[PDB]
Write a protein that binds this DNA or RNA. Structure first.
Ligand SMILES: [Mg+2]
Ligand SMILES: [Mg+2]
Length: 45
RNA sequence: UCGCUUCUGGCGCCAAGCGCCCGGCCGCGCGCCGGCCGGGCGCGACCCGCUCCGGGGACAGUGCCAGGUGGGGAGUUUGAC
């Protein structure tokens, strides 16, 4: 009777975006960057 | 094309709405059910993946030598009768 949906729109310019996983874009520290690049060189070279 | 917002000196969030399931405390007892109370993949809010996004790039640039220029600067000299 009173219970209603009232949804959101995660467009552009419209309502604020939610919290999703941002693991790929973190500013990782030094000891982590270094080893990952170290492994990649064993595939490039 | 794209996560869809252009007539106006407005508002916009914190866990949203719900949507499917698991659980506890009281009446049912067939308990993973009815009153108070919670978790959950996260459904909504698609998956997978090896460099944060772009721009350059085996040249710039750094080290050591070789040659030219170089009163900006340094040292000095600028006869005797
Ligand atoms: Mg001089
Ligand atoms: Mg002198």
């Amino acid at each position: 009777p009173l219970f209603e949906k009232r949804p959101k729109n995660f467009g552009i310019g419209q309502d604020i975006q939610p919290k999703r996983d941002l693991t790929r874009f973190v500013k990782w520290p030094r000891y982590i960057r270094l080893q990952r690049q170290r492994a990649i060189l064993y595939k490039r070279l």
